[PDB]
Amino acid sequence: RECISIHVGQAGVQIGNACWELYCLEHGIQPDGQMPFNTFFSETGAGKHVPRAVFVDLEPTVIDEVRTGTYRQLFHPEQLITGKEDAANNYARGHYTIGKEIIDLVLDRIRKLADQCTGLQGFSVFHSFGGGTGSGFTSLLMERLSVDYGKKSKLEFSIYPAPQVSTAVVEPYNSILTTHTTLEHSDCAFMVDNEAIYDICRRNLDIERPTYTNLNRLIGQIVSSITASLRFDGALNVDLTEFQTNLVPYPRGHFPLATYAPVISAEKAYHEQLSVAEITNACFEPANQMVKCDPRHGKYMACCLLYRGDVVPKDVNAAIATIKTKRTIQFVDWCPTGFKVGINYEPPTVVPGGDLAKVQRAVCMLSNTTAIAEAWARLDHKFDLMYAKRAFVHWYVGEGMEEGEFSEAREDMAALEKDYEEVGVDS
Amino acid sequence: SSIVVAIRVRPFTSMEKTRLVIRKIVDCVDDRMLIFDPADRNSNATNKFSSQRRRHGGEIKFVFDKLFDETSSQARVYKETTSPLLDSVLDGFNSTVFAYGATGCGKTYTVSGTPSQPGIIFLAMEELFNKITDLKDEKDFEISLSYLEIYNERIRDLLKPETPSKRLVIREDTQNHIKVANLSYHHPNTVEDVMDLVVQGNINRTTSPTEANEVSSRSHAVLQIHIMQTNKLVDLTSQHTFATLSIIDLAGSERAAATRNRGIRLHEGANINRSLLALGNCINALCLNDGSRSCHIPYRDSKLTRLLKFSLGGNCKTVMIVCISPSSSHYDETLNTLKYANRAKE
Amino acid sequence: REIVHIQAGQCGNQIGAKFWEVISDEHGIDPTGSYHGDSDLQLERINVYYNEAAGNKYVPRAILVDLEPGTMDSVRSGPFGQIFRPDNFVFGQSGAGNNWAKGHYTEGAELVDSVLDVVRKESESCDCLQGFQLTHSLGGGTGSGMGTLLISKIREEYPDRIMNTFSVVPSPKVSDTVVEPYNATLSVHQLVENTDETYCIDNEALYDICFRTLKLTTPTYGDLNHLVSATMSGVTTCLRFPGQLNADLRKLAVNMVPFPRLHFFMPGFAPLTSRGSQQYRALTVPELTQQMFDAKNMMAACDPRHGRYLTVAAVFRGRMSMKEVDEQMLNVQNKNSSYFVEWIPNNVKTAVCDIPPRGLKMSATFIGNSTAIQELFKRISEQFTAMFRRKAFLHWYTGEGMDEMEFTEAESNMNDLVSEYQQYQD
Amino acid sequence: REIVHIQAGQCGNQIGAKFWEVISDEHGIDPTGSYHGDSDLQLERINVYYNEAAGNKYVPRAILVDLEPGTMDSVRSGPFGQIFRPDNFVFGQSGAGNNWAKGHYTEGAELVDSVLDVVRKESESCDCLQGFQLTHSLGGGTGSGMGTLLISKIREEYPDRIMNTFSVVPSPKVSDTVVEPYNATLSVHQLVENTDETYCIDNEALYDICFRTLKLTTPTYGDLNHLVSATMSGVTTCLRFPGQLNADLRKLAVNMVPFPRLHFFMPGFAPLTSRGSQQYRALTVPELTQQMFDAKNMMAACDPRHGRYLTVAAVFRGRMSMKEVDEQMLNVQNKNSSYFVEWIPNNVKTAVCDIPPRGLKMSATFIGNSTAIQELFKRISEQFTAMFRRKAFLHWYTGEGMDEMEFTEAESNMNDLVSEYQQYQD
Ligand SMILES: CC(=O)O[C@H]1C(=O)[C@@]2(C)[C@H]([C@H](OC(=O)c3ccccc3)[C@]3(O)C[C@H](OC(=O)[C@H](O)[C@@H](NC(=O)c4ccccc4)c4ccccc4)C(C)=C1C3(C)C)[C@]1(OC(C)=O)CO[C@@H]1C[C@@H]2O
Ligand SMILES: CC(=O)O[C@H]1C(=O)[C@@]2(C)[C@H]([C@H](OC(=O)c3ccccc3)[C@]3(O)C[C@H](OC(=O)[C@H](O)[C@@H](NC(=O)c4ccccc4)c4ccccc4)C(C)=C1C3(C)C)[C@]1(OC(C)=O)CO[C@@H]1C[C@@H]2O
Ligand SMILES: Nc1nc2c(ncn2[C@@H]2O[C@H](COP(=O)(O)OP(=O)(O)OP(=O)(O)O)[C@@H](O)[C@H]2O)c(=O)[nH]1
Ligand SMILES: Nc1ncnc2c1ncn2[C@@H]1O[C@H](COP(=O)(O)OP(=O)(O)NP(=O)(O)O)[C@@H](O)[C@H]1O
Ligand SMILES: Nc1nc2c(ncn2[C@@H]2O[C@H](COP(=O)(O)OP(=O)(O)O)[C@@H](O)[C@H]2O)c(=O)[nH]1
Ligand SMILES: Nc1nc2c(ncn2[C@@H]2O[C@H](COP(=O)(O)OP(=O)(O)O)[C@@H](O)[C@H]2O)c(=O)[nH]1
Ligand SMILES: [Mg+2]
Ligand SMILES: [Mg+2]
């Protein structure tokens, strides 16, 4: 029942920081690993349990922050893999010249972890699409990892190149090149828009000035509910492969949206009275989508609802019945139902120094929909435009990345878009 | 005006014949009509239902101006395409011959091959020389030969590497005259000596010592024939013009990253791909801007594009040549270079 | 990693001297080379610009090149004579005298090896060489001659490393030589071909900024160089400490050059305000971007609003909201959609570092790849042409072995540069 | 929300200086810009008129425009030189010299952008711009020239925002220029077309008030401007704190302009009494309305009782009974039914704010849209005509490129204004 986490570039690492902070909080584990859970922490005889994680950055910077900051004592030094020269927002360099120089070490460290791990369920990769050290390197690693562990589940939690705003101008390229690897090798991928989150921080948490710290904490909190939640023994312990069983209808379509519906400020925690139906209803409102997408313009393929803390199955069922009664949101016509429920007994995790106020229960939604496919069209336009001018193409050609690879990457993305169109239309 | 795209393959040998269990990816079904095989009926998956695949299930149709195959002899393939280019040179404007492919795909072999067969350079001189001696009684022939290699973005004197690259500067005139600095220029006294210099050049070319192609030229080269014929008669219009024929060669390019791609292999590999990009930029700009009204072409991307500033772009004609492999071991490379040729066509 | 800083000519040396003042102060380094800073992050990447000599003496990873002894003397006599290493002081025969051919082709060429030997010595003291930074003028003669001379030589040694330069551009109304076009044209001819990124700074533009915004009664060269040094630091400051979004010379190039050759940038710096007006500052990200995208605060003479933005880098300093920054970037591109090149989806590349410049609560620096810069090239080309048509002053270069062909070739190639920028402007 | 205050010309600047004294005092702001008030409501809407700079320094959302350096100097040398922001001090070439064409058409036109840039900077520091307030004279030349010049420019930028102005009107018996009609006529010609509301204040009327009611031995400009500033505050005071009935520039316009073009208002102020007579005051709503509807307390020279009231705004300050106020409004309209325009059912718009002017127990301000004001326009038009018939002084504007057609067109259009007010009077 154990798993391995992987972190790349800067984003994957920073997100990881939030995740491992949460896990420590959940299990009472100290910054030096001391406990005063074995699926995240390798058992240590001294009590200093150590994270099952691989950290990669071709420019140690963010890892040095970890090495010098808190939880430097938590993580094992062998896990903190760094390079010398960064990929620098170039998928091709991360994929090849630079990334390939450490990929051997990376795989060796993974192997050690996998040899230590008895009941390995799968992996959880944290990456972006912007940087090459995230995008390109992950592409390399996932291919290699897929070969070694064809029977293990590969989760990818990605930071989706936001449609409204971004920070690098060559993102479209790195994003589209990643797509044909993730779609090929991953078992389930998640796409998260920073801008959608910032918007959530503004509206729900009432934050005028939001940053990566709080943003990442929300993302990590979702992952806790997806994974760690199961490992606390609830009423309905839905397996990670059980998620796939019910969420995924085809060989493809590995793109669920992960939302969190108890997002709430400390002030609201006093006035607001939440419950099962209230929170469940909130997660189907085109506001907490965690991505620039409006479900109301597509259909629901599948929807897993994960509950934590003080919930009962009766109310959950009733809320779902109400949703199906509402009939505002559309479901795939050839999918009789699409609702699956996971239930914990353990409460929601609270971050000291956070904002997300303490609640008695929580809901996460993992939903497959045809609406999300529209987001790729926006990326297609961005790509097509820059591609038409071959802008920045020489940075990938300088690596040796075949021009035709870009056209192939697009076609694979377009295929994916087409599949979702067929799902919604056909009956 | 408009350019011509022509294509041909190496062959398959006992190395491919031994491999009984393989499906070919190249199938020329007619003249100018290439079908990319084989779709997808694989036993390594399913695919026993209405296809939801992007292209893995269909066939890719490539249409060119003159597609050839292993059946057609280079004696015809060359002349069919370049006999008019040679004549074009003498129509008041210059011309040029291109090539394309991955390393080991028949460049070096197709320009000449085993020393008993015809090829690009041999037939160029064979045909021209016959025309020279037939027309020697009408016009005076002052023809010269320019030799050139490109390696690490550096211009080398193909025949005399003893001269430093600083002594080679690529310029062009407003008359489209080829202005290259101190270079060992020679004359086409006979094809034997011409080809001997070509061999001397190929010896001097700086090669790979890595892959199975370890002769592997790994450098570009351009051989330019500068024809300055003059009149034997005196009259009011007696002003015979001049023009040239560029023979373009490329290093060859392997998959984005090879299993031992280190150091100088990365460095030159980048320089090769950058040079190929530069050609792609200029070719695509040229063709698209011929469709449009204004032609701004990025001739400064490479020294080759400076070298071809007018050979590729002026009031002239050229043929694109691409070498194709029928093996699935070159599936991506061949397919991508086919698309390249088609984009160059349009 | 480590970066080599080479200074060439009086101009470049004076700018560099101010630069090393700034970053030594930034990293807590006193005039002995000893570290007495208050942070630990000052030593986290001190290796980038300093050798750690026995006794913890931090020694500028820099090479001081000049052909006019006396300027080099003023460096040794200055506060950093105890800082710079003596074998990095490279000088000999008297200077070019605004003669590019003397600087590049002949007299300077004789002393190339004395520089390159030091380059090698510096390289082999490094754990990972990232690239080179050259500081020089574009018309001085020695700085512009030795500049492109050394650039060529260095790239031959390190073809895969980053060639960065900060070049002071001939300004319309600020002169001091009548062959400024000859030297600039001959220089840029070789600059483009052998450079990965170059920054164009006009003394005239700085003269305007240092009064219009800083209200200086007597703007001196030490103040103009100070403005330059601020932006020089910003370019690489991201490499020397933690930040929300990292950045790099390579990263910038990847996001700043869309077309190989178009790697000329305009530099700018945020909070520009006089000491009596600082009390009226809001010190907000909005405020900073108002200044960063203000044409009047650009250190190139050409006003960006006559062209378009191929791509922009906005590197911020200090604690701030990532959303706040992103919002402002969006507002800017929405505000002037006609200025930004539509071929790019997100026209602005951003980066945010956790540490503001000591004494500032929050700052930033601006790097613009605009098409407007073509106009500076045009102006210079016209001046060059006018003289060249009469072969004016040509004998000064003829006597060094320079022919006419070089000059016509250079200009032809300068026209290509302008044409390319115009190609990508509507 | 936020409102921009622009001052134009010496007159406008002196009035504005007094205005900012008043409201800074109202909101507890000292001469450093620091807040030391006793209420919390002083900071509730401080953003309306102040930027909050680092250190809590509150900076007038105002632009200081003049063409005569020296007046601007007196502002900087005054108590608010530490208050106003230095980049809001816009001045250059010497002033028009009572030449409207210099102020609007030529010399002033050259410096428009230097104002508008500041306007934009102010706009982008706002969360929600409501409108603009212009303070100027109607005959000065620069204040009247730059006035309508900037009004046109600003509306082009912000056509949907509120254009408010406080204009000092040429007074029958109080002069200082013989081209007062030329400047006024040329000004109002453009004023009407581009203004949403304008207030007409006569120095003569104030000269009368400041003696008749305030018994001042030596009424100075600082005292006349003081009277003006009181009413200026009242117009927008409702926006800056709580009240039983809110009010607004828009709200007023909606209830004060019945016919698009007729947006000229007479201003007044309640408790007007000398310091020896204040002890005899009742301080009741009745008393206040007796003063507010007293023709002698109107700050326009024209006596309202020669015309009719199209609509009246009565804005009250401090704790009071809503019924008491309503009763008095009824009594007034019943008392002088012949004065009020019968076409309107309730001729008086009221508002009541919870906070009186510091030091007063209860106050109010009066805004009247009367038809009587037409007589001021007539008088000026007649003076203009008499001169214009001889083309007197015309060469001063001819030399600036102004033709006769403008002058005849302006007067024709001035006649329309008067005619319209007469149309709506019996
Ligand atoms: C009391 C106080 O806050 O003083 C400020 C100050 O008044 C102002 C006006 C500073 C001042 O800068 C100048 O007046 C200036 C002089 C010549 C050329 C350019 C600028 C200041 O001198 C500059 C100084 O800058 C720094 O300390 C930065 O770390 C800066 N350092 C240097 O440039 C430097 C100067 C001397 C010796 C060593 C370094 C820096 C900026 C970017 C990257 C690295 C370092 C600061 C904040 C101030 C003073 C001291 C008055 C300003 O400039 C900078 C670069 O910060 C000018 O507009 C800004 C706004 C600041 O508020
Ligand atoms: C002991 C005492 O009660 O003194 C009163 C006073 O004697 C009288 C006579 C004041 C006095 O006003 C004048 O004498 C005056 C001088 C020049 C121009 C106009 C008026 C007073 O000066 C004015 C002052 O007004 C205020 O405090 C208001 O808040 C007013 N403030 C200013 O005008 C102001 C003056 C100087 C510096 C900063 C602001 C205000 C009114 C409307 C909107 C905002 C602010 C008051 C009540 C008084 C004194 C002090 C004697 C009166 O005026 C006002 C505007 O209240 C004149 O008739 C009223 C009746 C008042 O009772
Ligand atoms: N959600 C989230 N996104 C981040 C965070 N940090 C960076 N990003 C995003 O990730 C993008 C770049 O991803 P990375 O792979 O981490 O970039 P990098 O680590 O510098 O790797 P290279 O850029 O290739 O050198 C940025 O444009 C951001 O949009 C973070 O902390 N949280
Ligand atoms: N049409 C052909 N028939 C028989 N042999 C061939 C043919 N084409 C290529 N070859 C052989 O394959 C080997 C040649 O590779 P070539 O020399 O053809 O590679 P290349 O394109 O010049 N490689 P590179 O220099 O790396 O770009 C030669 O020894 C040839 O004999
Ligand atoms: N920015 C800046 N430019 C300078 C300075 N001093 C000189 N220059 C410029 O540089 C040019 C001279 O370059 P210089 O270093 O003297 O070259 P050299 O004379 O060949 O050694 C002049 O034309 C100036 O425009 C300075 O302190 N700062
Ligand atoms: N209300 C008031 N009006 C003034 C004051 N000073 C001047 N004026 C009037 O404004 C006119 C001059 O305007 P001014 O600001 O000097 O315009 P400018 O001369 O063009 O700059 C004079 O005719 C006066 O009637 C003052 O302090 N208060
Ligand atoms: Mg990185
Ligand atoms: Mg070869």
Phi, psi dihedrals of residue C269, rounded to the nearest 5°: -140, 135
Tokens of A401: 């990345």
Strand partners for B142? B228
Please answer yes or no on whether C321 and A215 come within 8 Å at the CB atom: no
Contact D/A (≥3 CB pairs under 8 Å): no
CA atoms within 13 Å, Cβ hemisphere of C163:
23
> How far, in Å, CA of D165 to CA of D16, rounded?
12
Say which of B55, B257, B273 has its CB closest to residue A96. B257
- The pair of three-digit structure tokens given for residue A386, joined into one six-digit string: 């820059």
- Residue C53: Cβ within 10 Å count: 11
CB hemisphere CA count around A279 (13 angstroms)? 27
B289-294 long-range CB contacts below 8 Å, 24 or more apart?
A: B290/B1, B290/B2
Pairing of strands C197-202, C264-269: parallel
Q: Phi and psi (nearest 5°) for A64?
A: -65, -35
Instruction: Output the residue whose Cα is nearest ligand 4's atom 2.
Output: B10
Residues paired with A306 in a beta bridge: A342, A364
Beta pairing partners, D135: D7, D166
Are A287 and A200 in a shared domain?
A: no
Interchain proximity C413–B171, CB inside 8 Å: no
Smallest Cβ–Cβ distance between C261 and the set B152, B169, B300 belongs to B300
Q: Where are the alpha helices (DSSP H) in D318-403?
A: 322-335, 374-388, 395-398
Q: Mutate one of D87, D114, D119, D126 to test the C interface: name it (highest C CB count within 10 A).
A: D87
Closest to C20 in 3D by CA, of C75, C96, C98, C95: C75
- 3-class secondary-structure state, position C369: strand
Method: cryo-EM
Q: Do chains C and B touch (3 or more CB pairs under 8 A)?
A: yes
How far, CA to CA in Å, does B346 sit from each of B284, B339, B342? Answer: 8, 11, 6
Residues 66..105 of D with a Cβ closer than 8 Å to C: which? 85-87
**Domain range D1-258, its CATH number among 3.40.50.1440, 3.40.50.300, 3.90.245.10, 3.10.50.40:** 3.40.50.1440
The helix or strand, by DSSP H or E, that contains position B227, with its residue range, turns out to be strand B220-231
State how far the alpha carbon of A165 is from the alpha carbons of A386, C5, D168, D274, in Å. Answer: 16, 35, 50, 64
CA C285 – CA C270 distance, rounded (Å): 10
Length of chain D: 426
Six-digit token pair at B101?
Answer: 């492919």
**Residues C335, C133: Cα–Cα separation, whole Å:** 35
Q: Is A343 on the interface with C (CB under 8 A)?
A: no
Give the integer Cα–Cα distance in Å for D150 and D147.
5
To one decimal, the resolution in angstroms is: 3.9
SS3 of residue C352 by DSSP:
strand
Going from the Cα of B251 to the center of ligand 4, the distance in angstroms, rounded, reads 12
Name the CATH topology of C259-372.
60s Ribosomal Protein L30; Chain: A; (3.30.1330)
D31 within 8 A of D80, measured Cβ to Cβ: yes
Last residue of a domain, one of A256, A288, A306: A256
Q: Are residues A222 and A359 in the same domain?
A: no
Q: Which chains touch A (3 or more CB pairs under 8 A)?
A: B, C
Residues A170 and A263 in one domain: no
Compute the CA torsion angle C272, C277, C280, C282 (nearest 10 deg): 10
CA of A414 to the centre of ligand 7 (A): 28
The gap from C-alpha A74 to its chain's centroid, in whole angstroms, comes to 23
Is C18 in contact with C229 (CB distance < 8 Å)? yes
* Cα-based torsion angle of the residue sequence C72, C73, C75, C78 in order, rounded to the nearest 10 degrees: 180
- From CA A181, how far away is CA C5, in angstroms rounded? 41
Are the Cβ atoms of C420 and B171 closer than 8 angstroms? no
Q: Measured in whole angstroms, how far is the alpha carbon of residue D29 from the centre of its chain?
A: 23
CA atoms of A126 and A226, how far apart (whole Å): 14
| A361 and A326 in a common domain | yes
Is residue A320 left, alpha or beta, with left meaning phi > 0 and alpha meaning psi from -120 to 50?
Answer: alpha
Residue A427 to residue C413: CA distance in whole angstroms: 63
Q: What's C159-215 look like in SS3?
A: CCCEEEEEEEECECCECCCCCHHHHHHHHHHHHHHCCCEEEEEEHHHHHHHHHHCCC
What CA–CA distance (Å, rounded) separates C155 from C131? 10
Helix (H) or strand (E) holding C151: helix C142-157
Tell me the residue range of the domain where A344 lies: 257-371
Instruction: Provide the strand spans (E) within C270-383.
Output: 309-317, 348-353, 363-370
Q: In the CATH hierarchy, which top-level class contains the domain D373-426? A: mainly alpha
Q: Which whole-number Å values give the CA distances from C8 to A35, A419, C84, C168, in the listed order?
A: 60, 61, 15, 12
Task: Identify the nearest ligand to the CA of B333 by its number.
Answer: 4
The C-alpha atoms of residue A23 and residue C44 are separated, in whole angstroms, by 29
Domain with CATH 3.30.1330.20 in chain C: 259-372
CB atoms within 10 A of CB C94: 13
Q: Do A385 and C345 touch (CB under 8 A)?
A: yes
Please answer whether residues B89 and B127 qualify as being in contact, where contact means their C-beta atoms are separated by less than 8 angstroms. Answer: no
- Greatest distance between any 2 Cα atoms in chain A: 61
For D406-426, b/e burial (b = at least 16 CB within 10 A) is ebeebbeebeebbebbeebee
- Distance in angstroms (rounded) separating the CA atoms of residues D195 and B147: 79
Q: How far apart are CA A244 and CA A222, in angstroms?
A: 17
Q: Which two three-digit tokens encode residue C279?
A: 């009390």
Residues recorded for chain B: 346
Question: At which of A371, A395, A418 does a domain end?
Answer: A371
Q: What lines the ligand 6 site, CB under 6 Å?
A: D 9-11, 14-15, 68, 95-96, 98, 103, 137, 139-143, 168, 176-177, 203, 221, 224-225
First-to-final CA distance of chain C: 41
Of A96, A97, A394, the CB nearest to B274: A394
Residue contact A210–C44, C-beta within 8 A:
no
User: What is the C-alpha separation between D138 and D146, in angstroms, rounded?
Assistant: 11
Chain B neighbors of C423, CB-CB under 8 A: 296
Assess B270–A contact: CB distance below 8 Å, yes or no. yes
Residues A108 and A238 in one domain: yes
Cα B170 to Cα B181: distance, rounded to the nearest angstrom:
7
Give me A51's structure tokens: 């994270």
If we measure between CA atoms, which residue out of A145, A11, A193 comes closest to residue A89?
A11
Tell me: is residue C98 an annotated ligand-binding position: no
Which residue(s) pair with C191 in the sheet? none
Alpha carbons within 13 A on the beta-carbon side of C351: 31
Contact D196, D253 (CB under 8 A): yes
What CATH number corresponds to the domain at position A161?
3.40.50.1440
In chain D, ranges of CATH 1.10.287.600 domains: 373-426
- The SS3 call for residue D340 is strand
Size of interface C-D (CB pairs under 8 A): 29
- Please return the burial class of D186, using the count of CB atoms within 10 Å of its CB with bins 0-12, 13-18 and 19+: buried
- Give me the residue label for tokens 């080309």: C381
- DSSP 8-class letter at C109: G
What is the 3-class SS of chain A, one letter each residue?
CEEEEEEECCHHHHHHHHHHHHHHHHHCCCCCCECCCCCCEECCCCCECEECEEEEECCCHHHHHHHHCCCCCCCCHHHEEECCCCCCCCHHHHHCCCHHHCHHHHHHHHHHHHHHCCCEEEEEEEEECCCHHHHHHHHHHHHHHHHHCCCCEEEEEEECCCCCCCCCCCHHHHHHHHHHHHHHHCCEEEEECHHHHHHHHHHCCCCCCCCHHHHHHHHHHHHHHHCHHHHHCCCECCCHHHHHHHHCCCCCCCCEEEEECCCCCCCHHHHCCCCHHHHHHHCCCCCCCCCCCCHHHCEEEEEEEEEEECCCHHHHHHHHHHHHHHCCCEECCCCCCCEEEEECCCCCCCCCCCCCCCCCEEEEEEEEECHHHHHHHHHHHHHHHHHHCCCCCHHHHCCCCCHHHHHHHHHHHHHHHHHHHHHHHCC
Q: How open is the CA angle D284-D288-D293, to the nearest 5 degrees?
A: 150
Q: Which residues of chain C are in CATH 3.40.50.1440 domains?
A: 1-258
Task: Find the radius of gyration of the CA atoms of chain D.
Answer: 21
Annotated binding residue at D370? no
For residue C306, what is the DSSP state?
A: G
**Which strand (E) or helix (H) includes residue D210?**
helix D203-212
**Touch between D and C (at least 3 CB pairs under 8 Å):** yes
Q: Does C283 touch chain D (CB under 8 A)?
A: yes
What does the alpha-carbon distance between residue C197 and residue C192 come to, in Å, rounded to a whole number? Answer: 9
Distance (angstroms) between ligand 5 centre and the Cα of C417 equals: 24
* Claim to verify: residue A217 and residue A94 sit in the same structural domain: yes
Angle between the N-to-C axes of helices C285-292 and C322-335, in degrees from 0 to 180, rounded to the nearest 10 = 40
Strand, coil or helix: what is D307? coil
Q: Cα separation of B188 and B317, whole Å?
A: 23
| D225 marked as binding residue | yes
Alpha-carbon distance A324 to A284, whole Å? 11
Closest CA to C311 of C253, C352, C377, C255: C255
- Helix crossing, C142-157 with C112-123: angle to 10°? 50
Residue B53: burial class (beta carbons within 10 Å; 0-12, 13-18, 19+): exposed
Chains A and C form CB pairs within 8 A to the count of 107
Identify which of D74, D58, D76 has the alpha carbon closest to the alpha carbon of residue D10.
Answer: D74
CB-based contact D60:D34 (threshold 8 Å): no
- Are residues A190 and A106 located together in one domain of the fold? yes
A127 and A246 part of one domain: yes
User: For A89, left (φ over 0), alpha (ψ -120 to 50), or beta?
Assistant: left
d(CA D396, CA D401): 9
| Helix, strand or coil, per DSSP, at residue D66 | coil
Which residue in C160, C312, A250 sits closest to B46, CA to CA? A250
Ligand 3 pocket residue status of A216, Cβ below 6 Å? yes
* Closest chain A CA to residue C326: A165
* Other CB atoms within 10 A of residue D81 CB: 14
Nearest Cα residue to atom 17 of ligand 2: D223
| C180-193 and C404-423 helices, crossing angle to 10° | 70
What sections of chain B are H helices per DSSP?
A: 14-17, 74-89, 120-135, 191-204, 264-291, 303-307, 331-345
Tokens 């040899």 -> residue: A115
Q: Supply the residues of A annotated as catalytic.
A: 242
Q: Which residues of C touch A (CB under 8 A)?
A: 1, 40, 44, 127-128, 130, 242, 244-246, 248, 250-251, 253-255, 257-260, 311, 320-324, 326-327, 329-330, 343-351
For residue D201, which atom of ligand 6 is closest to its CA? Answer: 1
How many alpha carbons lie under 13 Å from residue D368 in its C-beta half-sphere? 28
Q: What is the CATH number of the domain that holds A331?
A: 3.30.1330.20
> Phi and psi (nearest 5°) for D308?
-135, 160
Same domain, A365 and A381: no
Tokens 């990293």 sit on residue = C27
Contact C208, C297 (CB under 8 A): no
Confirm or reject contact between A60 and chain C (CB < 8 A): no
**Number of domains forming the structure of chain A:** 3
Contacts of D70 (CB under 8 A, 6+ apart): none
The token duo for A166 is 């971004």
User: Three-class SS string for A47-106?
Assistant: CECEECEEEEECCCHHHHHHHHCCCCCCCCHHHEEECCCCCCCCHHHHHCCCHHHCHHHH
- Which chain B residue shows the shortest CA-CA distance from A408? B336
- Chain C residues with CB under 8 Å of A164 CB are 330
Of C278, C279, C281, C361, which is best to mutate to test ligand 1, by the most ligand atoms within 8 angstroms of its C-beta?
C278
- Same domain? For A394 and A425 the reply is yes
Q: Which member of A89, A388, A394 has the closest CB to residue C251? A: A89
Rg for chain A, CA atoms, rounded = 21
Tell me which residue has tokens 């790697």: C263
- Ligand 3 pocket mutation, candidates A13, A96, A137, A159, criterion most atoms within 8 A of CB: A159
Residue B56 DSSP class? B
Residues of chain C with C-beta less than 8 angstroms from the C-beta of B169 = 409
Residue that has been written with the tokens 């009181």 in this structure: D230
Residue list, ligand 4 pocket, CB within 6 Å: B 10-11, 101, 103-109, 213, 216-218, 251-252
Give the integer Cα–Cα distance in Å for D291 and D269. 8
Residues with Cβ within 8 Å of residue B159, at least 6 apart in sequence: B147, B184, B186, B197, B200, B201, B204
To test ligand 2's pocket by mutation, which of D14, D20, D21, D22 has the most ligand atoms within 8 angstroms of CB?
D22
Q: Which amino acid is at A109?
A: R
* Ligand with an atom nearest the CA of residue D101: 6
Task: From A196, A223, A256, give the residue that closes a domain.
Answer: A256
Q: State the Cα–Cα distance between residues B292 and B281, nearest whole angstrom.
A: 16
Are A186 and A97 contained in the same domain?
A: yes
Is the preceding omega at residue B38 within 30 degrees of 0, hence cis?
yes
Both A215 and A84 in one domain: the answer is: yes
Q: Residue C120: exposed, middle, or buried by beta-carbon count in 10 A (0-12, 13-18, 19+)?
A: exposed
